[PDB]
Structure formats: structure tokens, C-alpha cells
């Protein structure tokens, strides 16, 4: 369970290194949309929510926005692409604090391919 790291400017911009054998923790709050951006050239195939009515999903290209639609919206999200599948544990917060506006992935698998 990997917890994304914040930027030095604002805590709402968070970074995580991709790991195929781990799940990414996403804290969602009321009235906040989170922007998850895929890797360049990566093609969306399918996603699945553990609870579809808990969250809203919108995608255009490699840009994904999620947003809670219900109370106690605690579920998981799996997005499968041409190159990988992303595992997110979506956990709604109570105090509307510590929101996440974007999640950006650092891919060391492509770095190893380059190596």
C-alpha cells in the first residue's frame, strides 16, 4: 500500500512511483475532483470500480478525473491499459482536509527498460 508523496509547494499535488505489485492509496474528499494522469502514449482499455455509484469517472485520452458521489465512498479502482494496470484504494475522508488534486506516476519500469 503505497502512500503518494506531496510536492514542496502544495500538499494537493502528489507523486507516487509505479509498482506492479502494489496498490496506490488515494484519499478522496467531499467536493474535490482528483486528476490522475496516465503515461504518455498509454492506451486506456478498461476500468472497474468496486462500487460504481460511489465515484464519478471521466476520461479523455490519458486524463482521468474521479470524484465521490455518495457517503462512505470506500472502494477500489483498477485501470488496465496496454502497458500496465493501476490499483487504487479509494478512501473517502471525513474532515474535508488533505485533499489530492492530481496524482502523478513516476515509472521505474520504463527507466529499467531504458537501462
Amino acid at each position: 500500500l503505497d502512500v503518494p508523496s506531496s510536492s514542496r509547494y502544495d500538499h494537493r499535488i502528489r507523486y507516487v512511483t509505479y509498482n506492479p505489485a502494489d496498490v496506490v492509496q488515494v484519499d478522496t474528499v467531499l467536493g474535490v475532483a482528483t486528476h490522475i494522469m496516465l503515461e504518455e502514449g498509454e492506451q486506456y482499455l478498461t476500468h472497474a470500480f468496486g462500487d460504481s455509484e460511489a465515484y464519478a469517472f471521466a476520461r479523455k485520452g490519458r486524463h482521468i478525473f474521479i470524484k465521490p458521489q455518495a457517503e462512505l465512498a470506500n472502494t477500489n479502482l483498477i485501470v488496465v491499459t496496454d502497458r500496465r494496470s493501476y490499483k487504487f484504494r479509494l478512501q473517502m475522508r471525513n474532515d474535508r482536509n488533505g485533499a489530492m488534486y492530481e496524482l502523478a506516476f513516476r515509472y521505474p519500469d520504463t527507466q529499467a527498460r531504458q537501462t
Binding site: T46, H47, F49, S52, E53, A54, L72, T75
Partner: peptide
Amino acid sequence: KTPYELARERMLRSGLTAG
């Protein structure tokens, strides 16, 4: 009635993808 029960009903009711 209690929000845990409504959440559980929502989790049972929903599909894998919204549509």
C-alpha cells in the same frame, strides 16, 4: 436506514463500470 446499511446496499447494487 443507518448509513452503513445504505452503503452496503449501494455496494451490492452497483456494477463494475458506470454506464
